[PDB]
Amino acid sequence: TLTIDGKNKILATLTPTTIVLHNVDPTADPTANKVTQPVAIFFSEPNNGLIASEDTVNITVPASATVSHFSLWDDNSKCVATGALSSPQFFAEEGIYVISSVSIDLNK
Amino acid sequence: TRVHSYRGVLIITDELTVEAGSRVSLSGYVSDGGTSDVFTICRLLD
């Protein structure tokens, strides 16, 4: 039942910095199934209680790999949030996976 | 909390240029006569 002023004055401290891709749904503390090497992801300023990534992030995906779930990480090597990307994909060969944006939101 | 993400397109930028060269080769020598027709001895008269 938080208010926008609150909502915003909360996610400002979150600051996720790293994103890791996973083949299957993450566990309570996802440590296995890490398919891609971690990469930096620059987030943005809270506004209306939701923060979204600002840079189109490109991640190398190894051959014969599938990507369906992601886990954001902070600077303390502690997984913050977990979810699933809209469209999974199989990379039969060496390729690059692109994420247009990820939006941590609290409006629902 | 949603945590729901999105997905984009693979956009890449590269600058490509192909180049070539040129060289001019010439072979000449001082004229010492020349291939003539009917090479015969002659007796000029004025």
PDB file of N, CA and C in Angstrom, chain A residues 70 82 87 89 97-101 103 105 108, chain B residues 1-12:
ATOM      1  N   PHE A  70      16.395 -15.081 -16.490  1.00  0.00           N
ATOM      2  CA  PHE A  70      17.467 -14.161 -16.146  1.00  0.00           C
ATOM      3  C   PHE A  70      17.434 -13.878 -14.651  1.00  0.00           C
ATOM      4  N   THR A  82      14.658 -12.113 -10.084  1.00  0.00           N
ATOM      5  CA  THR A  82      14.673 -13.173 -11.079  1.00  0.00           C
ATOM      6  C   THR A  82      13.389 -13.127 -11.892  1.00  0.00           C
ATOM      7  N   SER A  87      10.578 -14.028 -24.922  1.00  0.00           N
ATOM      8  CA  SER A  87      10.736 -15.088 -25.903  1.00  0.00           C
ATOM      9  C   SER A  87      12.048 -15.822 -25.689  1.00  0.00           C
ATOM     10  N   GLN A  89      15.029 -18.765 -26.576  1.00  0.00           N
ATOM     11  CA  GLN A  89      15.681 -18.997 -27.855  1.00  0.00           C
ATOM     12  C   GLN A  89      16.761 -20.056 -27.700  1.00  0.00           C
ATOM     13  N   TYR A  97      23.018 -12.493 -27.809  1.00  0.00           N
ATOM     14  CA  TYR A  97      21.660 -12.278 -27.334  1.00  0.00           C
ATOM     15  C   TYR A  97      21.496 -10.814 -26.948  1.00  0.00           C
ATOM     16  N   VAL A  98      20.387 -10.214 -27.368  1.00  0.00           N
ATOM     17  CA  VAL A  98      20.132  -8.794 -27.166  1.00  0.00           C
ATOM     18  C   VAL A  98      18.920  -8.660 -26.246  1.00  0.00           C
ATOM     19  N   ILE A  99      19.022  -7.757 -25.271  1.00  0.00           N
ATOM     20  CA  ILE A  99      17.896  -7.408 -24.410  1.00  0.00           C
ATOM     21  C   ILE A  99      17.625  -5.920 -24.565  1.00  0.00           C
ATOM     22  N   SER A 100      16.461  -5.573 -25.117  1.00  0.00           N
ATOM     23  CA  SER A 100      16.136  -4.165 -25.316  1.00  0.00           C
ATOM     24  C   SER A 100      16.020  -3.430 -23.988  1.00  0.00           C
ATOM     25  N   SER A 101      15.349  -4.033 -23.011  1.00  0.00           N
ATOM     26  CA  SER A 101      15.148  -3.387 -21.722  1.00  0.00           C
ATOM     27  C   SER A 101      14.623  -4.399 -20.717  1.00  0.00           C
ATOM     28  N   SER A 103      12.613  -3.925 -16.902  1.00  0.00           N
ATOM     29  CA  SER A 103      11.979  -2.900 -16.084  1.00  0.00           C
ATOM     30  C   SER A 103      11.539  -3.500 -14.752  1.00  0.00           C
ATOM     31  N   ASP A 105       9.515  -3.040 -11.743  1.00  0.00           N
ATOM     32  CA  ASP A 105       8.332  -2.213 -11.571  1.00  0.00           C
ATOM     33  C   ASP A 105       7.612  -2.619 -10.294  1.00  0.00           C
ATOM     34  N   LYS A 108       2.211  -2.878  -9.760  1.00  0.00           N
ATOM     35  CA  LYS A 108       1.245  -3.964  -9.639  1.00  0.00           C
ATOM     36  C   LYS A 108       1.745  -5.032  -8.676  1.00  0.00           C
TER      37      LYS A 108
ATOM     38  N   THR B   1       5.597  -6.531  -7.493  1.00  0.00           N
ATOM     39  CA  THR B   1       6.828  -6.703  -8.255  1.00  0.00           C
ATOM     40  C   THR B   1       6.579  -7.506  -9.527  1.00  0.00           C
ATOM     41  N   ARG B   2       7.134  -7.034 -10.643  1.00  0.00           N
ATOM     42  CA  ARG B   2       6.968  -7.712 -11.922  1.00  0.00           C
ATOM     43  C   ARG B   2       8.267  -8.363 -12.375  1.00  0.00           C
ATOM     44  N   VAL B   3       9.343  -7.572 -12.435  1.00  0.00           N
ATOM     45  CA  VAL B   3      10.668  -8.009 -12.872  1.00  0.00           C
ATOM     46  C   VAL B   3      10.636  -8.392 -14.351  1.00  0.00           C
ATOM     47  N   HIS B   4       9.473  -8.262 -14.988  1.00  0.00           N
ATOM     48  CA  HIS B   4       9.321  -8.687 -16.376  1.00  0.00           C
ATOM     49  C   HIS B   4      10.188  -7.840 -17.301  1.00  0.00           C
ATOM     50  N   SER B   5      10.901  -8.498 -18.213  1.00  0.00           N
ATOM     51  CA  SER B   5      11.855  -7.839 -19.089  1.00  0.00           C
ATOM     52  C   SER B   5      11.283  -7.719 -20.502  1.00  0.00           C
ATOM     53  N   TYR B   6      12.126  -7.293 -21.440  1.00  0.00           N
ATOM     54  CA  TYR B   6      11.748  -7.173 -22.842  1.00  0.00           C
ATOM     55  C   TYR B   6      12.845  -7.756 -23.722  1.00  0.00           C
ATOM     56  N   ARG B   7      12.750  -7.548 -25.032  1.00  0.00           N
ATOM     57  CA  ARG B   7      13.733  -8.099 -25.953  1.00  0.00           C
ATOM     58  C   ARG B   7      13.806  -7.183 -27.166  1.00  0.00           C
ATOM     59  N   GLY B   8      14.990  -7.107 -27.769  1.00  0.00           N
ATOM     60  CA  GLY B   8      15.189  -6.222 -28.900  1.00  0.00           C
ATOM     61  C   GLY B   8      15.673  -6.912 -30.157  1.00  0.00           C
ATOM     62  N   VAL B   9      16.324  -6.156 -31.036  1.00  0.00           N
ATOM     63  CA  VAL B   9      16.911  -6.696 -32.254  1.00  0.00           C
ATOM     64  C   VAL B   9      18.424  -6.559 -32.170  1.00  0.00           C
ATOM     65  N   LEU B  10      19.122  -7.403 -32.928  1.00  0.00           N
ATOM     66  CA  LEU B  10      20.578  -7.350 -32.986  1.00  0.00           C
ATOM     67  C   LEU B  10      20.986  -6.262 -33.970  1.00  0.00           C
ATOM     68  N   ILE B  11      21.486  -5.146 -33.451  1.00  0.00           N
ATOM     69  CA  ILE B  11      21.902  -4.008 -34.261  1.00  0.00           C
ATOM     70  C   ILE B  11      23.415  -3.898 -34.148  1.00  0.00           C
ATOM     71  N   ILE B  12      24.098  -3.906 -35.287  1.00  0.00           N
ATOM     72  CA  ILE B  12      25.550  -3.816 -35.324  1.00  0.00           C
ATOM     73  C   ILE B  12      25.954  -2.784 -36.366  1.00  0.00           C
TER      74      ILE B  12
END
